[PDB]
Ligand binder design. Structure first.
Ligand SMILES: [Mg+2]
Ligand SMILES: [Mg+2]
Ligand SMILES: [Mg+2]
Ligand SMILES: [Mg+2]
Ligand SMILES: [Mg+2]
Ligand SMILES: [Mg+2]
Ligand SMILES: [Mg+2]
Lengths: 133, 153, 56, 164, 48, 46
RNA sequence: AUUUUACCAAUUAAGAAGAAUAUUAUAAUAAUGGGUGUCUUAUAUUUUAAAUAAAUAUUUAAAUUCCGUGUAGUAAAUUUAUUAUUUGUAUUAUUUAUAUAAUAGGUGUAUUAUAUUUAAAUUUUAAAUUUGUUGUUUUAUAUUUAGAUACAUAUUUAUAGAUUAAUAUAUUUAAAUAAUAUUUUAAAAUUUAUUGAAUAAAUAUAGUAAGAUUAUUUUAGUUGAAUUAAUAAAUAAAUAUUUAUUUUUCUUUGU
C-alpha cells in the first residue's frame, strides 16, 4: 500500500576528496603530464634548548615525495568523474580556469553575483550610514 | 488518542479478550470517530452577560437603568456560542482577551486543515491570522479575463 | 501500435472471446486495412499442399 | 539517522486497523453507540433541507409542529404483520403479530383498537427477535429487518378458515 | 460537466428536489434487504 | 495467533471428502469458504 | 495328462470469459477528522507556545580547523506548481495467475563392475573452505519460478603555461568542460516511543566475521620475489589493464 518512499540522493562535494592537509604540506609542480608533488626537506623534531646550535645545516630545500604516495593522492583526486577517461584529474590547488568554469556554465549566465570571482575579490566599500539593529 | 483511550476503556470494562463475537465486533466498532465540536472554555470568574447592567446610571423615578446611546455605541462585543454576542463596557474587555482568540481561531484542530499551509498556492490564497484558516478573495477566470481585456494587455 | 490486430495483445491478456470474434475467420493486414479472410488449413493432396476450409 | 533519503509522505500505521463497519450478521449483532458526523448531517438535511433552506426557529424545532413529529402523528407508520399459521384453519385464542421494535404493549393495543377495531385484548406477550438472515446464490449475507413478536390474548378464540 | 461521479446511483425525484432523498434511500435499502420480486432461492441457507 | 482449518480443499481441487460437507452441511467445514452455487442454480431453477 | 519363465519403458496440445471499469508511476484546479444496517440532548463532543519540517536548498575559492562534511537573490506576487475517477478503458508507459493428466503388457540381462546394442575397455557427483592447498568444515530430494548495476564512445563557430613561504617574477612547447554511481544476505545492543517480557520505527551503523554474486568452444611475459620509520643516497617487487623503444654481432634473449 504505502510505506516510506525513497527520494533523490544529494551528491557529495565536488572538492570533498582534496584535503587541506595535502594543500598545506605538499605542492604540485612540473609540466601537465609530469606533475610531481613536492614537500620541503629536512627532519621535523622538537628537542630541548641547547641542541642544533648551528643553523647552517638546517636547509630550506624541496624534495619530491614517494611515487606511491603521489599516486595515492592523485587517485584520491581522480575519484571524481572516474568513468570519463578523457577528463584529466583535478589539481591540488584550484586554478583560474576552475574558478571561472565554476560559473561559466549556462545555468549561471543570469546571476550577476558569483561571476568573475565575486567570492575571490575583496568586498566593496560599505555605505557610511550602514547600521544594524 | 481518543480511539486508543476508548479501546482501553472498553477492554477494561466489557471485553473478555476472547474469540467471542462480542469482542470481535468491539475491535471493529471502537474505531469509529465521535463528534468533534470546539467548546470554548467557560469563564465562571467573570460572566460577560452579567456586565450588561454595569457602568450605567439609573433614573431615580422608575428605579431602572438609563439607555445611554454613547454606552450602547462604545460597547465592546464579546462572542460566545450560546450567547452569540454580548455587549460589555470597554474597561472590562481586557479580562476576555482569550475568548477573542478562541473565537477568531477556526473551530477545528489545526492538523485537520494543516494541508493548507503545506503548499504555496494555499499559502498565498488563504489567511493565517490568529489561526483562522479562512479563504481570502479570489477573482473568477471570467473576471480576470475581463479585467485584462479592458486593460488591453 | 499503428495497426492493432484483433488477435494481438496490447495492455491486455489473451481472452478467447475478445481476441477471436470468429474462429473460422483469419485477420490480416492488406493495404493498411484489417482484412478478414476465411481460415484455411494445409492438407497433402496428390503431392502438393492444398488449402481447405479450416472450420469444416 | 538518514532522514534526507525519504520524501514527505506519512507511512501507514502498523498494524493497520479494521474499518469501523460491523461485518457480523449473527445473533449477537451490536449497535454502535459512537455517533458520527455524517449521521447528524443527514438528520439535519432530511429535517429542514440543509443547507439550502434557512433553519426553522428553536420553537418550531422543539414543538409538536415540527415536520417529522407532525407527520408521525398525523400519518403513523407501523408495520403489523399477522402470522398465517397461528390463526389459519385453527380456532386459536393467542394470535401473534409482528411489529417494529419501537412499539409496546399499549402501543399495539391502541393500534388494534383504533385502526382495526380489535378492542377485546386481554394481554400482549412481548418478545424481541433478531431479523432473519440468509445467503443468496452468490453467497452474500443479507439480513432482513428486525421485528418484535407479540402474542395477543383475546377473550374469544378466533379463526380464519381456508376454503380448500 | 457531471455534478456527481458516474458510479453514484441517482436517488432523487423527477423534478430535482431532494426532499425525500433519505426516504428513497431507505426504500432502496429495504429492496436490497428483501426484494419483492425475489424468486425461489437455491441456497441451503434459506431464511425459513 | 494461529487459525484452525479442519478440512479444506487441496491445491488441485475440492475432493469428495469436502463435497460431502458441501452437500450435507451446506458449506465447507471451515467456514472461511463462501458458499457459491450460482452454476447449479442456473442449471436447475432458471 | 495340463501347459505362454523371471527381470527390463516412456510426459505429453489445454476442456471451459477458471483472467481486467486489473498492478505500479503518471493529473500540479477539491479538501473540517469517511463509515453504509444512519437517525433525541452534550455541566459529558476544547491543543494551543518565535527553533529543521508532511514547507525538502542551481559551484570546485578562502576561512575558522589536530581527516575544511562547505557556494551567495535572479528577478522584487514571475510562469517549480503537493496534483487524482473522467469531457478519451483520463493519457503515456510497465507488469500479471500455482484447478482440472488414459498415453505403450516388453530392444540389450538371466551364476553380480557402473549408457552408447560385436558382447570387452573404462569411473564414485558437483560448488565453496582448507595456502601443511587433505582423509578438515558446511550446503545441495526433485520440478517450475524469483534472486545481485563502476557509462569499453566525444566532428568545422572555441578561446586552456607556471611559479616565491610572501611581497614578487614571468625570454619554455598541449588538450575531446565532463561531475550524479560503486555488489547482495548477514556477524550487536545500545536508540526513539507506545501498551500492560511483547508492540512500531531504525538498508541507522560492526578496523567490518562468514558465504552467494547469473554469460563455453578462448589466442602471447615472469610461479616464492620485494622488506633502509626521519637532512643533499640512481632505483621496492610481484599480479593485472593499456602503452613504447625494428642499430650493428655466430646463433639466441619479455626491456
Ligand atoms: Mg578539504
Ligand atoms: Mg602509488
Ligand atoms: Mg530389457
Ligand atoms: Mg486457465
Ligand atoms: Mg487546492
Ligand atoms: Mg530464473
Ligand atoms: Mg608488467
Amino acid at each position: 500500500r504505502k510505506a516510506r518512499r525513497v527520494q533523490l540522493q544529494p551528491t557529495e562535494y565536488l572538492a570533498q576528496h582534496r584535503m587541506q592537509v595535502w594543500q598545506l604540506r605538499f605542492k604540485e609542480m612540473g609540466p601537465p603530464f609530469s606533475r610531481v608533488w613536492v614537500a620541503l626537506g629536512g627532519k621535523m623534531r622538537r628537542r630541548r634548548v641547547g641542541r642544533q646550535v648551528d643553523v647552517k645545516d638546517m636547509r630550506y630545500y624541496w624534495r619530491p615525495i614517494e611515487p606511491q604516495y603521489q599516486r595515492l593522492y592523485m587517485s584520491r583526486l581522480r575519484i571524481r568523474d572516474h568513468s570519463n577517461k578523457l577528463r584529466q584529474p583535478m589539481r591540488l590547488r584550484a586554478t583560474n580556469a576552475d574558478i571561472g568554469s565554476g560559473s561559466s556554465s549556462i545555468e549561471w549566465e543570469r546571476a550577476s553575483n558569483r561571476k568573475y570571482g565575486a567570492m575571490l575579490a575583496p568586498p566593496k566599500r560599505q555605505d557610511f550610514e550602514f547600521r544594524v539593529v | 488518542m481518543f480511539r486508543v483511550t476508548g479501546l482501553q476503556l472498553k477492554n477494561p470494562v466489557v471485553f473478555k479478550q476472547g474469540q467471542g463475537m462480542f469482542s470481535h465486533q468491539l475491535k471493529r466498532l471502537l474505531q469509529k470517530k465521535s463528534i468533534h465540536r470546539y467548546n470554548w472554555d467557560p469563564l465562571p470568574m467573570y460572566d460577560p452577560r452579567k456586565l450588561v447592567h454595569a457602568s450605567r446610571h439609573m433614573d431615580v423615578e422608575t428605579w431602572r437603568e438609563v439607555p445611554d446611546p454613547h454606552w450602547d455605541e462604545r460597547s465592546y462585543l464579546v462572542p460566545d456560542q450560546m450567547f452569540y454576542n454580548i455587549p460589555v463596557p470597554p474597561e472590562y474587555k481586557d479580562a476576555y482577551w482569550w475568548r477573542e482568540l478562541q473565537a477568531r481561531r477556526v473551530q477545528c484542530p489545526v492538523e485537520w486543515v494543516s494541508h493548507r499551509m503545506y503548499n504555496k498556492g494555499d499559502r498565498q490564497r488563504y489567511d493565517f491570522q490568529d489561526l483562522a484558516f479562512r479563504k481570502k478573495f479570489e477573482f473568477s477566470y471570467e473576471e480576470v479575463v475581463k479585467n485584462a481585456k479592458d486593460m488591453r494587455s | 501500435p499503428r495497426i492493432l490486430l484483433d488477435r494481438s495483445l496490447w495492455k491486455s491478456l489473451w481472452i478467447t472471446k475478445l481476441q477471436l470474434p470468429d474462429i473460422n475467420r483469419w485477420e490480416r493486414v492488406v493495404n493498411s486495412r484489417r482484412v478478414t479472410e476465411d481460415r484455411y488449413a494445409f492438407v497433402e493432396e496428390e503431392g502438393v499442399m492444398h488449402k481447405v476450409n479450416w472450420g469444416l | 539517522w538518514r532522514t534526507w533519503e525519504y520524501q514527505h509522505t506519512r507511512p501507514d500505521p502498523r498494524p493497520f486497523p479494521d474499518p469501523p463497519v460491523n461485518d457480523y450478521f449473527g445473533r449477537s449483532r451490536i449497535w454502535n453507540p459512537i455517533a458520527c458526523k455524517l449521521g447528524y448531517v443527514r438528520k439535519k438535511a432530511d429535517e429542514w433541507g440543509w443547507p439550502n433552506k434557512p433553519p426553522p426557529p428553536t420553537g418550531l424545532r422543539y414543538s409538536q409542529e415540527f415536520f417529522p413529529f407532525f407527520f408521525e402523528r398525523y400519518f403513523p407508520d407501523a408495520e403489523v404483520r399477522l402470522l398465517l399459521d397461528s390463526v389459519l384453519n385453527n380456532e386459536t385464542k393467542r394470535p401473534v403479530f409482528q411489529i417494529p421494535c419501537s412499539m409496546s404493549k399499549v402501543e399495539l393495543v391502541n393500534y388494534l383498537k383504533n385502526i382495526y377495531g380489535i378492542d377485546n385484548v386481554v394481554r400482549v406477550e412481548v418478545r424481541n427477535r433478531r431479523g432473519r438472515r440468509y445467503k443468496n446464490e452468490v453467497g452474500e449475507i443479507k439480513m432482513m429487518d428486525d421485528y418484535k413478536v407479540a402474542v395477543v390474548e383475546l377473550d374469544t378464540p378466533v379463526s380464519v378458515e381456508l376454503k380448500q | 460537466q457531471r455534478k456527481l461521479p458516474k458510479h453514484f446511483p441517482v436517488v432523487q425525484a423527477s423534478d430535482g428536489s431532494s426532499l425525500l432523498r433519505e426516504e428513497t434511500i431507505a426504500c432502496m435499502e429495504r429492496e436490497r434487504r428483501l426484494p419483492h420480486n425475489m424468486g425461489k432461492l437455491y441456497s441451503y441457507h434459506r431464511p425459513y | 495467533p494461529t487459525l484452525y482449518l479442519y478440512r479444506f480443499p487441496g491445491p488441485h481441487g475440492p475432493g469428495p471428502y469436502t463435497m460431502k460437507y458441501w452437500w450435507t452441511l451446506g458449506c465447507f467445514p471451515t467456514g472461511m469458504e463462501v458458499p457459491f452455487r450460482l452454476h447449479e442454480f442456473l442449471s436447475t431453477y432458471q
